[PDB]
Amino acid sequence: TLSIQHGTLVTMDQYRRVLGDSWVHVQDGRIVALGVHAESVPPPADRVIDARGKVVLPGFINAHTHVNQILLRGGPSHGRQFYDWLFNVVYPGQKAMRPEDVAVAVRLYCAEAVRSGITTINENADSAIYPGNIEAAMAVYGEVGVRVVYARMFFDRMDGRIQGYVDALKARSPQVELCSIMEETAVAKDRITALSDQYHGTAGGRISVWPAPATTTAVTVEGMRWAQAFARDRAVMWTLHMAESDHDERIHGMSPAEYMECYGLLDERLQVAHCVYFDRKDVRLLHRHNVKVASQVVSNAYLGSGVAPVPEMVERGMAVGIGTDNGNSNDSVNMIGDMKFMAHIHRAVHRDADVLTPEKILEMATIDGARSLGMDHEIGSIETGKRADLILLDLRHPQTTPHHHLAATIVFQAYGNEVDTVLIDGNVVMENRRLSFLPPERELAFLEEAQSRATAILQRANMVANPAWRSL
Amino acid sequence: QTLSIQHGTLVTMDQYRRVLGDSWVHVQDGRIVALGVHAESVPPPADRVIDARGKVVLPGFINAHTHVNQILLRGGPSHGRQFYDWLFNVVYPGQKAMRPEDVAVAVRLYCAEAVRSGITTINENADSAIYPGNIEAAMAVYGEVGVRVVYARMFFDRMDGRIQGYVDALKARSPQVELCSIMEETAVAKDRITALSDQYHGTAGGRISVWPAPATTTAVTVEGMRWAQAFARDRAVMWTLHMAESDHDERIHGMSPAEYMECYGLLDERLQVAHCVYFDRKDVRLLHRHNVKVASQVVSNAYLGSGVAPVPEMVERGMAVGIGTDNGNSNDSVNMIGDMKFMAHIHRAVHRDADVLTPEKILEMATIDGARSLGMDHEIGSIETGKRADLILLDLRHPQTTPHHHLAATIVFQAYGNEVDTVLIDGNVVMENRRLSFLPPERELAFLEEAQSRATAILQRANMVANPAWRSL
Amino acid sequence: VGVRVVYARMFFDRMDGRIQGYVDALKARSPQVELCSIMEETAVAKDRITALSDQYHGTAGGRISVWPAPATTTAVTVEGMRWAQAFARDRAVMWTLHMAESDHDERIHGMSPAEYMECYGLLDERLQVAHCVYFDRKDVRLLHRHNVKVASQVVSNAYLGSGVA
Ligand SMILES: [Fe+3]
Ligand SMILES: [Fe+3]
């Protein structure tokens, strides 16, 4: 049992209560009780965590990300439109990674993520097809203690239209191999079903498995319908990348949202990612079927895609979470940095300093994010009965001083290093910035290994790591 | 007295943009005296050696336009408001309620944040210099801290009567907060600024400079702007003005502020303009023609709902565009690395062009081009012989900055702003292993509590709401 | 007749001087038709509307109701709008105003009428606004936030060449 005491609790509960000098009691992975110190004595606990002078929040929820690609950041990944990045960087880089590289990628990602207060990660696994990768990744997620949705991507249909464009893009890095990860529909089903049977609900309920048809052009109608029915039969969600680029825009003369509507493929268990190339009608169609959304505001900028209509969706009460997207289209895994970006980009583009409140941005990173993953009954707020995914932030630093309104301070001032202590499913995963799965005496050597492995991955893939200085 | 920084990777920002692995820098009497590569040359003897092994050495970051004292108004009171709403309901009244002893604490807090993020030069646009005691309080702290400072003394000498019914409506949003005026007579502004320059310009070993700062083209007379212009020329400094930050500035007398200034011969190579959001192609051509310097406040232009300035166009014309963090309470951080990432992304998003500004270019804007925007590029902004020793040491051995191959990309797209370890300004160690010379670790927490209290009290005296009720929509 | 009727009594208590040279030009289209004024002093509008409400509100078997109706945000003072707002609250009715029907209404003092009303706390759940043609995304958000009611005059917005809300 664990008692967190004397903090300010930012509950994100139904009344958005903010409780000064208050406590939380945790038992068997759950929040069992809460109270105010002046009115009540906290129950006895095996241990007390002192949060005096600190702010307690629900853990941040990364609503859509791609983990293993983190080893491709730091030089190779920037300055390219989506498809250029995909074909010259992501596909070949992923392919050159071995299972032992994956294990290091995952631990590096989880170290950055937990340090920034992320406790749930929706991993869209585009490299699950390669032998050994699932097993390597899953062993590290389990050990680390993070809550993970492992959304297994598949592609079962050739999009032949885009080929002369692809060859031109490939000529930018001709020594880098063009890859294919297409699989037959029935093979994808069997592989995802077996993955779910083996890993879903493992690591004490912390790991889930979803089917992830990649896009409306890369997956057949049958494949998407299978994913849809699978989500329904197993009480999970299914997810798809929607309208991330201007070449996706026209699946057969209508938008991807329209196309899915025609086939009855929009439902309340679908979470779509991106939605940059969206019009009013598309928003209406998602709204009507209660589709969940993950917005990758930073990555949409990094890749030169654009700006999604998040304010419109939010004003319709839609469940919109925030994803950091790829470890190499951001290039950080920092929810607080992404929140600030979500606040500012929309203000700038609408010329409206009040287009999204910092409270609302904080909601997107917590309780609404949970809702976007279909997990809001279990996580995303500090409420009795929910899982004990909790973070303690210290605002006593120069950047976060002064602080009066907590959501404003967090969104507009915090850098992302203010998170001290992190609980996931009631287990202490970080304490005073010390990571339980990467102790301080191993941290530097681990980073050097990740650095070396990245350098080697890029050599095997024939990718340029450090292009010559260019001002224009 | 001498200092040797050894075994770092030097990101010089010099004329060839040299990046020198396992290299050294020798510092003497506030100046970079020599550099070299360890494998080809032995460093000169020095009184002390700073070991930068495994670290990256950069020129110090340059904050090309900011407002310091306002930092005590962040944390609740300042967000969610268009420029004029923010100005009249927050900034003016908040500043007015601050006493000199509050100003001293504001300045130290700002400098602590700034130095911790690698900022070594600050262009402080002082909008509260009119209040007795404020200059002296601020200057003593800047001096003690060791930071390089341009103190640009803002003035307003003309009523802009057009915007009054708009102002009253805006004031009704916070009716208990007092409307207040900082207008002065032209001649009084001139005398005050001249005296401030005579007393403080070149002080603190040359670290402190004084510029005149006519506020805007509507708040200052032609005569006031011409005086500022001539003053800059006679004293070999710059003058600065806020340009086209909002859609209500846009029309000084039926043309843009740039056109208006052109008409009166007020665009010249010693002018540094701030903002330039409401700018068209012609305005950019006019600034370009006269070699006007520009400070872009990309983050604040978003925060205040103003928009996005045409930075790519200016940069492609070779113009000197620096990056400013702007107000301590329209950002609301003082973090150059965070703002660089925002500069990189906002423009990519708006142009739908992932390559619209390279991370190298963004790093140039924060260093050598920033120096150029202040007219100080002969003295600072690059690691070159003869220039001042304003240098920062970054450690990239953290999760977020791993892996790292291309340094500018890593810094711009991965660094959070806490990776700066050690900071030199004018050759003096102002920060070492994150320990601040002017705010030692055993005083830090108590100082932050005092800033917090003083802020709470400032807001009470001004009748400003600190912590508005939770609002989702 | 037996119809259910809300009688929203319009008033105007403030001169909008800005639009006068425009008005004279318009008047020259029919110069023999006289230019009229229906302005009243604030206190007179209040007394008249109060007396009308006391006399007719709830009559004809509850079929007739009386609301105050400040005409627009440029033709009524802040004090007049606030009185209407409080009157609606005290008597459990609504108040109503014409909003942003034309491109010359658009700028009450350098912001939209919705913004102007928000500044003074004049958007609430008992307000019903009419028209909303010259409205942007921010205006819609402001109304939504305060649960303002809306009447849309789609045919008339066409007939008069205003546009489409
Ligand atoms: Fe994605
Ligand atoms: Fe400014």
Numbering used by the authors:
A (entry chain B): 3 to 474
B (entry chain A): 2 to 474
C (entry chain E): 146 to 310
Paper lines:
Atrazine chlorohydrolase (AtzA) was discovered and purified in the early 1990s from soil that had been exposed to the widely used herbicide atrazine.
Atrazine was both soaked into crystals and co-crystallized with the protein, with the co-crystallization experiment resulting in crystals that diffracted to 2.2 Å resolution. For this reason, atrazine docking was investigated using extensive molecular-docking calculations with the RosettaLigand docking protocol. The bond lengths between the bound cation and ligating amino-acid side chains are longer than would be expected for a metal centre of this type, with lengths in the following ranges: Fe–His66, 2.68–2.88 Å; Fe–His68, 2.76–2.96 Å; Fe–His243, 3.01–3.14 Å; Fe–His276, 2.76–2.99 Å; Fe–Asp327, 2.41–2.49 Å. Although no negative density was seen when the Fe atoms were set to 100% occupancy, the resulting B factors were over double those for the nearby residues. As a result, we have set the occupancies of the Fe atoms to 50%, which gives much more reasonable B factors.
